[PDB]
Ligand code: HEC
């Protein structure tokens with residue numbers, strides 16, 4: 001999917017986790033976010049100056065999703081252990097990683 | 107003032123906002139952070155002592171304080187509207203910006 005579809009998937013499913021009642025909902029949302037993050041990882045940010053694939057800026061972009069996926073996996077482990085409240089708190093910690101990447105385009 | 111002293115001003119006024127009870131305290135602390143951020147913006151950080159003021163590194167360093175000041179101005183607006191709770195949440199959300207500059211420059 002394109003970057004915009006991925007970002008909608010991420011934003012939508014973070015809200016799903018926030019209002020979820022059970023682990024199945026949290027796990028399903030986190031699984032969808034993980035796929036969307038790995039999809040977006042291969043895209044190019046539209047406002048980036050040097051879009052050269054090996055530029056530090058492009059590596060910092062790709063690495064942002066590595067960090068995001070690691071955090072998604074942290075939350076997935078908690079949800080996999082039936083720790084719904086804890087997984088939800090872990091998902092909230094994603095937000096600063098989202099915002100970090102966005103700030104490179106502001 | 108130097109970066110370390112301005113950073114102390116920012117860190118301490120973050121705590122003043124956290125324990126504040128009214129809009130006057132929050133406004134006073136945010137205004138103090140705004141001033142410290144604009145003073146810090148004048149400085150070349152240690153890891154860039156080698157770099158010109160028109161260098162892209164320094165443009166982005168100064169831009170980071172503009173982002174932070176923009177967010178402080180949003181929190182000020184909330185406090186001037188008497189939304190004391192929302193202003194305090196906004197001040198907390200600043201910490202993500204604090205950490206992002208640190209990753210790239212500290
Ligand atoms: C880079 C490493 C990113 C991470 C991590 C996240 N997002 Fe993102 N997002 C990214 C880019 C390059 C952009 C476009 C910026 C621009 O030039 O406009 C976005 C944008 C969004 C949006 C706005 C919708 C859109 O532009 O199509 C949303 C709602 C969004 N992103 C959500 C989001 C969330 C919830 C994230 C973490 C869980 C997240 N993004 C991470 C790049 C990156």
Ligand code: HEC
Nearest residue numbers: 109110113116117151167170171174200203204207211212
């Ligand atoms: C760049 C745009 C920055 C923003 C935004 C914020 N800070 Fe910062 N901070 C920055 C640098 C380059 C440094 C290193 C200075 C040095 O001489 O090494 C720092 C350091 C700090 C510190 C440590 C201070 C010390 O005496 O070692 C603190 C406590 C700190 N910064 C706090 C802080 C807060 C709370 C911020 C947002 C509200 C914030 N900083 C923003 C650069 C930047």
Ligand code: NI
Nearest residue numbers: 060100101206
């Ligand atoms: Ni970054």
Ligand code: NI
Nearest residue numbers: 108109110111
């Ligand atoms: Ni000093």
